């Protein structure tokens, strides 16, 4: 949900609008919600991840006090931390 | 179809008179329809006058005018000279106006030492019609991919302050420099994540 | 000749006393330009209002009078 | 010696006592009048600061195109459209008729119903302008008659809005309801006025005592208003002097109407600035009709000097620096707002405002009369009378001034200025600003009396400027009660206070009840917005569908040699407004978007991207530079907009960007022969030997046996160079934004130190142009092209100026200068360094010199290089830097504009560069670089780079025999060459 | 000006008898004493002594206004045209349009005398012409060649190549002719020897 | 300054150097004669006279009001109004002050 | 201090 909020912020045209994800509970069916989200932002489906959002994604994956994500996002120096934890 | 004339527009008494005169005379000799003035872009009102980069900035502005359809207005045009009403084929907007498309832009520069220069820039859409459909789709896919790569590189480097990456080494080694040159069909290939020349791709029958 | 001898001796004695020959002339020209500033302010006001309105606003009242 | 030690101290104390005398004189005047009245009498008016607008011929076409494209895109049939049509008709002339005829007769209808609408509306407007051909420009106000309306929401929020009157839609119906009057005020509109009913707008005739409502004069005035509403009103050959006509006032709408009718108006502004200049500029561009002329002047109505100077300027002939105009009307609506000033609070502000409203007004009228020797062209003085002389509350001397203006009616007869001025006292009614009284406007209107808009009041006064009321004023002073029946309200102040206090006591109680109900609900019961951030893209040209492109262009398939067709694939800038993107945003829009603001802050070093730990909390985003604190993307604009605009574009030359170069303190040295030899100074062996070599017998060198160093005595007759400074005429330049650093783009400090800033601009621009072409890696050229076909045909006109200054002056001064500074001074070393750092091409390398016209010449040489087969890709463009000596030499030849004369004319740096403008007086020197990556069309398609445009033509030319190097000429007319005697 | 530069480190006083000012350079003021050094390079390939533009007929007005590199260019261009047998430079226009006689020559650092003027003589407040910068440009030589001899409106290119600029001028001239922009073009290169360039 | 000083002196008590009086009436008939001053001749004399007749009159009234904390002893201001506001000839700002 | 006074006096007499 935080990643979706970041995408909203990235692709909103300098206008604070109503977030599609007002609460996390409605993401329990994420396929339809992601569909509606990226129909609001069609250009997000064609634009590669801006690296500000990439670093945000990496620090989200490394956010402490969170269940570590079930994937390796990067192969930087902290690859063992992602691989073994 | 010449909609915009990117004037040298140096805010000089002789320059803006002479330049408007020559643009009007050339438009009139070229049989331009009466009541069809070229819009005048005077980018120096905002950007000032760089001697070297004047025509370059005006050409970049003309490029952007062609892309977006917007004709910027001379916002410092407090009052157009009455002597320029003489020139019926030139218009001098003071506010940016969005057009439904600009086919071509005429960039004109006048340098010290009796050095006038004119460039005519035409929209890409008239280039893309001289090639078949399949070539166009291949080109469009390639530009889409390249725009993705460029978006990444621009954001990578704008944050990390690595916009300019100095090349430490040429794509050819000192040993292969002369074969690399001496083969007109020599072309770099990817090796060690860098585009460099290789001994195999030089004077090769495959390239020919 | 002798006058120049004597001037140069004089400026010398000033140097070693740590005195400034032209300091009070400096102060005078500074005060003169300050006076010119005040005079042009007064002149602008005066030309804005006039001599009658000017000399008519003087204090006449006094409690002891 | 016969000298006085303390003579100059005596003079100082004398001058100090004189300064004290002057200071106590000034302090007496000041305690007598006050600081407000004091600093309010300064001279504001200056004849050189006057701004003329007369290019209605240009603005007609400008507005025509604006409306044409607005309708073509559906942004606009409506009243504002009809108003713009009226303005274009007012400016209608044969050239404009031909202009619209071309643009409509060649409007394609098949593109859409929107294009069909644009066309048919254009045909109608062409017919209307043809009918208007040769007839006068008429002020015709077609805005919908709006009335007050206040709604207090159930939450207690008062909202006031101007809402179109149901029974009144046009100014014709406005005049009709004026004639009808109301219950409280008890074929032409003369026959409409009900018997024993006073219309809201009426003219009062002076009986044998006072002023009373008059039927015939009121009917004449209302008939004039009806004629103005239906046919419009011409003010041609009307020379007006209007004051108090700033934005959001009745006077501004008066000026709009006058300049629509064709008047030649001198508008006063007490706050002369670029903002006000632009406001009056675009007001003339909209409304300035055929024959109209707007003269915006700085002017303080509080100063008799300003009054006399402005009147002198108006009545002086153009040869003597004036306008050579004889005023037909005077509208002195300039006033100072004074609230909370009772009898006991009558202060400096009140006396000064009274001076403006009455005394300097009378002086202005008297000055006009003194300037007129003719007795057959009176000036119509539209006095802003008020119906409320002290009835309302604490207003200072406002009521005193307004009632004092009523003596002019009797003074018209009693004195000998009747043939020179006519008195038209307009008792202006309740006018709605377009705020504290707007909320009660509806309440006062509900009882039968009415409340005017600024447009309505302006229409009333402009009708008071009718030919009929003009001659009426000529034969008899006119008292025009434009009060909307308010005179018939007993205890107007008490009624107004009752209305306002009822409204406030309703809104506040509703708000309090809402707040406490919300708190009660919160006690009983115990959306998140998205935060915008920059979506920076490059926006390669939008590649449209093949069907639609083939619809754009005819069957041109397989005709052009794409190898011989050259196209711009990339481009970039380094300039006063950053790069191409930010410069284009400021050009096309005049303001930075979110992406533009963040990009400007990034290039200027206001912000830097932070990743990792920031005060423990993990942060990934922009942070400040000087404080390293987080900056949200909205606060980027909110915090850096003012500094970005202040330190970008054309602005005062900043010495920090040019090695301490202060134009105000331009350093020079003068040769002086030593008359009395100097005292020894110590230097090294080689330095002393160099001194002896230079000075010969005019200096002595001696070794110090203790230290071994030499001491130098500069003997009499030696020459030395004492520094001196002069104030340089040019203080403003188009400089790269402050904080622009090559490190921000990533150029190593080794390159920055060894290589000159012009070349740093070139390197940044070349990188940005290649990556505008999508060339992430510059060596990717060599995947499709041989190293011998990537050229660099860019070049400067005088590039390397910093290195030139080094070698020519710093070396003369023995300052630390790099051994290879000449190497960096060459104009081709920029392209050299570009190749050595980025490309490593062995392709054609051309470096044009063209002074101002070198970038287009670079493009031409690039076209030639590609078409000759020498190259497939080439970097074209141009670059230069701003430096002390180049600026000084451009000033010597009067090529740049004198910023001191510009300040004398009231201009600011943001408006110093005025291309194609009446008063332009030289160019604005800037610095920076501009690069384009141009390529063959075939290669551009093969590599899939963004084809930005096609270089269909490029050419260079010279003028003729002459003896003027910088003089431009018609040489580049050699691009339009044809025999007519296919 | 001295007071403006030196601030409190100098004093200026009016002489009531004459009205001119007297300047006292106080302690701590900075001044520039000339010094001289022996420079390692004493030998240059100089134009023969006594070479004058008057000998070829360039008016003294041109010699005074325009800089010696450009005088060399004018002499060389006249001699090259009359090597081509072009007695009258306007004889080009009997066979060619004025838009097809170019001048693609250029210097590597041309205008060095004018550069020295603006950068050093101007700093020393010596008499320098107000338009020295126009003479400092590298394209002003070709500009004066056109203004005095050709009167062409053909393509005008001014290459910079330091040492290898005359061959580059020839290359640009070939390109200009073969593109149809010109039929005749003046290609070459020029430079002057001066103190600062040598140093 | 004279207006304020005189009002202060009137309303100050004898110990502080004033009169210790509370004004029951004000009769400000002080005026400057200005003849031959039309609209074009409005001068320093005219503006000064207007000040005396209107502005400093209002300031005198306001100073008396400021000095009075009592609300039960008003001062009767006998204003010298005129019936002729500009009907007669060249009188500077006299009619303006009176109206 | 005094020695410098005296050096100045000394060179002065020489000058004149
Ligand atoms: C660059 C391209 C060149 C040409 C391409 C321009 C395209 C752009 C077309 C203009 C767009 C207005 C359409 C035209 C038609 C008039 O020429 S309108 C101007 C003349 N009309 C008037 O003066 C009428 C004003 N008086 C009235 O009473 C009007 O009816 C009112 C007040 C606006 C409305 O009143 P009601 O609706 O009758 O009630």
Curated annotation (Swiss-Prot), chain A:
Role description: Fatty acid synthetase catalyzes the formation of long-chain fatty acids from acetyl-CoA, malonyl-CoA and NADPH. The beta subunit contains domains for: [acyl-carrier-protein] acetyltransferase and malonyltransferase, S-acyl fatty acid synthase thioesterase, enoyl-[acyl-carrier-protein] reductase, and 3-hydroxypalmitoyl-[acyl-carrier-protein] dehydratase.
Subunit structure as annotated in this protein's UniProt entry: [Alpha(6)beta(6)] hexamers of two multifunctional subunits (alpha and beta).
Family indicated by similarity: Belongs to the fungal fatty acid synthetase subunit beta family.
Protein name, per record: Fatty acid synthase subunit beta
Curated annotation (Swiss-Prot), chain C:
Membrane-crossing residue ranges in chain numbering: none
Subunit structure as annotated in this protein's UniProt entry: [Alpha(6)beta(6)] hexamers of two multifunctional subunits (alpha and beta).
Span within the parent record: 333 to 397 of 1885
Entry protein name: Fatty acid synthase subunit alpha
Role noted for this protein: Fatty acid synthetase catalyzes the formation of long-chain fatty acids from acetyl-CoA, malonyl-CoA and NADPH. The alpha subunit contains domains for: acyl carrier protein, 3-oxoacyl-[acyl-carrier-protein] reductase, and 3-oxoacyl-[acyl-carrier-protein] synthase.
Assigned protein family: Belongs to the thiolase-like superfamily. Fungal fatty acid synthetase subunit alpha family.
């Amino acid at each position: 949900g935080d990643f979706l909020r970041r995408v909203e912020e990235r692709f909103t045209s300098s206008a604070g609008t109503v977030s599609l994800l007002q609460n996390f509970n409605q993401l329990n069916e994420p396929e339809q919600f992601t569909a509606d989200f990226f129909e609001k932002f069609p250009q997000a489906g064609k634009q590669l991840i801006s690296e500000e959002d990439c670093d945000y994604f990496l620090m989200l994956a490394a956010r402490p006090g969170q269940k570590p994500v079930p994937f390796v996002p990067v192969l930087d120096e902290r690859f063992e931390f992602f691989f073994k934890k | 179809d010449i909609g915009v004339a990117s004037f040298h527009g140096t805010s000089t008494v002789a320059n803006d008179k002479n330049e408007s005169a020559t643009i009007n005379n050339m438009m009139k000799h070229l049989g331009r329809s009466e009541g069809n003035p070229v819009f005048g872009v005077f980018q120096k009102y905002l950007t000032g006058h760089p001697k070297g980069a004047a025509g370059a900035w005006m050409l970049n502005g003309a490029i952007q005018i062609l892309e977006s359809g917007l004709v910027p207005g001379n916002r410092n045009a407090d009052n157009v000279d009455k002597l320029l009403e003489q020139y019926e084929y030139v218009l001098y907007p003071s506010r940016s106006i969005q057009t439904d498309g600009i086919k071509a832009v005429s960039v004109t520069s006048f340098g010290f030492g009796q050095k006038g220069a004119q460039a005519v820039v035409v929209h890409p859409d008239y280039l893309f019609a001289v090639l078949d459909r399949s070539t166009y789709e291949e080109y469009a896919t390639k530009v889409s991919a390249r725009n993705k790569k460029t978006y990444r590189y621009m954001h990578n480097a704008i944050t990390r302050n690595t916009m300019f990456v100095a090349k430490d080494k040429a794509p050819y080694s000192d040993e292969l420099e002369q074969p690399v040159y001496l083969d007109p069909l020599a072309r770099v290939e990817e090796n060690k994540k860098k585009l460099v020349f290789s001994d195999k791709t030089i004077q090769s029958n495959q390239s020919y | 000749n002798k006058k120049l001898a004597k001037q140069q001796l004089e400026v010398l004695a000033r140097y070693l006393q740590s005195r400034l020959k032209q300091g009070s002339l400096k102060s005078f020209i500074k005060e003169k330009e300050a006076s010119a500033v005040l005079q042009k302010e007064l002149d602008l006001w005066e030309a804005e209002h006039g001599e009658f309105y000017a000399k008519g606003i003087q204090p006449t009242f006094s409690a002891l009078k | 010696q016969s000298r006085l030690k303390q003579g100059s101290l005596k003079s100082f104390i004398k001058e100090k006592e004189a300064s004290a005398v002057l200071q106590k004189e000034l302090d007496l005047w000041e305690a007598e009048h006050g600081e407000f009245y004091a600093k309010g009498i300064q001279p504001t008016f200056s004849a050189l600061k006057s701004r003329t607008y007369d290019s209605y011929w240009n603005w007609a076409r400008q507005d025509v195109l604006s409306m044409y494209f607005d309708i073509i895109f559906g942004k606009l049939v409506d009243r504002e459209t009809i108003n713009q049509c009226i303005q274009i008709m007012n400016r209608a002339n044969p050239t404009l008729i031909k202009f619209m005829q071309y643009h409509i007769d060649h409007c394609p209808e098949y593109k859409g119903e929107t294009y069909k609408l644009a066309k048919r509306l254009g045909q109608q407007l062409i017919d209307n302008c043809k009918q208007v051909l040769t007839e006068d420009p008429v002020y015709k106000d077609v805005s919908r008659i709006t009335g007050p309306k206040t709604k207090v929401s159930a939450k207690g929020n008062i909202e006031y809005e101007e809402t179109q009157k149901d029974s009144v839609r046009k100014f014709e119906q406005y005049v009709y309801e004026m004639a009808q009057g109301g219950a409280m005020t008890k074929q032409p509109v003369s026959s409409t006025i009900p018997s024993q009913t006073i219309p809201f707008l009426h003219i009062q005739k002076k009986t044998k005592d006072g002023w009373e409502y008059n039927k015939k004069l009121s009917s004449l005035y209302l008939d004039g208003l009806e004629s103005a509403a239906i046919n419009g009103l011409t003010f041609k050959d009307k020379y007006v002097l209007v004051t108090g006509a700033g934005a959001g006032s009745i006077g501004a709408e008066i000026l709009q109407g006058l300049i629509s009718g064709g008047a030649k108006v001198i508008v006063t502004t007490s706050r002369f600035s670029k903002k006000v200049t632009e406001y009056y500029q675009n007001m003339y561009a909209r409304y300035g009709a055929a024959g109209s002329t707007l003269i915006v002047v700085p002017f303080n109505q509080g100063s008799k000097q300003d009054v006399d100077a402005l009147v002198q300027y108006i009545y002086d002939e153009p040869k003597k620096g004036g306008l050579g105009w004889d005023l037909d009307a005077i509208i002195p609506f300039a006033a100072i707002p004074e609230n909370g000033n009772g009898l006991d609070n009558i202060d400096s502000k009140s006396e000064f405002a009274h001076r403006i409203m009455l005394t300097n007004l009378l002086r202005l009228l008297g000055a006009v009369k003194s300037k007129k020797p003719t007795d057959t062209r009176p000036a119509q003085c539209i006095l802003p009378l008020s119906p409320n002389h002290g009835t309302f509350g604490f207003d200072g001397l406002y009521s005193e001034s307004k009632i004092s203006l009523e003596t002019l009616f009797n003074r018209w007869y009693s004195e000998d200025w009747g043939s020179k001025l006519t008195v038209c006292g307009a008792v202006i009614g309740w006018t709605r600003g377009t705020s504290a009284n707007n909320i009660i406007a509806e309440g006062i209107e509900k009882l039968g009396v009415r409340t005017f808009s600024q447009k309505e009041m302006a229409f009333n006064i402009l009708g008071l400027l009718t030919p009929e009321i003009v001659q009426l004023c000529q034969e008899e002073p006119v008292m025009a009660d434009l009060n909307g029946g308010l005179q018939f309200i007993d205890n107007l102040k008490d009624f107004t206070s009752k209305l306002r206090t009822d409204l406030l006591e309703t809104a506040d109680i509703r708000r309090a009840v809402s707040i406490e109900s919300a708190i009660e609900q919160k006690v009983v019961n115990g959306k998140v917005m998205v935060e915008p951030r920059a979506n920076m893209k490059f926006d390669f040209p939008t590649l449209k569908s093949y069907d639609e492109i083939k619809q754009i262009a005819p069957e041109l398939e397989g005709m052009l040699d794409l190898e011989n067709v050259v196209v711009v694939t990339g481009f970039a800038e380094v300039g006063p407004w950053g790069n191409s993107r930010t410069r284009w945003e400021m050009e096309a829009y005049g303001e930075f978007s979110l992406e533009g603001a963040i990009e400007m802050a990034w290039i200027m070093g206001f912000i830097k991207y932070h990743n990792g730990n920031l005060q423990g909390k993990p942060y990934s985003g922009w942070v400040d530079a000087k404080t390293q604190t987080p900056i949200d993307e909205k606060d980027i604009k909110s915090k850096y907009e003012e500094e970005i605009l202040e330190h970008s574009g054309i602005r005062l030359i900043e010495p920090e960007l040019f090695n301490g170069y202060d134009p105000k303190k331009k350093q020079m040295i003068q040769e002086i022969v030593v008359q009395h030899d100097l005292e020894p100074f110590e230097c090294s062996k080689e330095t002393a030997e160099q001194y002896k070599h230079e000075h010969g017998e005019k200096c002595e060198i001696f070794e110090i046996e203790e230290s071994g160093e030499y001491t130098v005595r500069i003997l009499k007759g030696a020459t030395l160079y004492v520094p001196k400074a002069l104030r340089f005429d040019r203080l403003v330049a188009g400089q790269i934004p402050t904080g622009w650093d090559a490190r921000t783009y990533g150029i190593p400090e080794d390159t920055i130190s060894q290589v000159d800033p012009i070349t740093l601009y070139v390197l940044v621009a070349t990188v940005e142009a290649l990556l505008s072409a999508g060339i992430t890696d510059p060596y990717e050229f060599y995947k499709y092209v041989h190293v011998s076909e990537v050229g660099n045909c860019s070049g400067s006109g005088m590039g390397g100026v910093s290195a030139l200054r080094g070698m020519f002056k710093d070396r003369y001064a023995d300052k630390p200068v790099q051994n290879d500074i000449l190497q960096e001074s060459f104009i081709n070393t920029m392209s050299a360094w570009v190749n050595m750092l980025l490309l490593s091409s062995s392709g054609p390398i051309k470096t044009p010199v063209g002074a101002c016209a070198t970038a287009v010449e670079s493009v031409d040489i690039g076209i030639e290089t590609i078409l000759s087969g020498k190259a497939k890709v080439v970097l074209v463009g141009g670059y230069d830097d701003f430096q002390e000596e180049g600026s000084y030499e451009f000033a010597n030849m009067n090529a740049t504009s004198n910023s001191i004369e510009e300040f004398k004319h009231g201009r600011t740096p943001k408006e110093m560069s005025r291309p194609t403008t009446t008063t332009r007086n030289g160019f604005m020197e800037a610095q920076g670089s501009g690069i384009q990556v141009i390529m063959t069309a075939d290669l551009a398609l093969k590599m899939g780079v963004p084809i930005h445009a096609v270089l269909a033509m490029t050419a260079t030319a010279t003028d003729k025999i002459g003896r003027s190097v910088p003089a431009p000429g018609k040489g580049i007319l050699t691009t339009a060459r044809e025999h007519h005697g296919s």
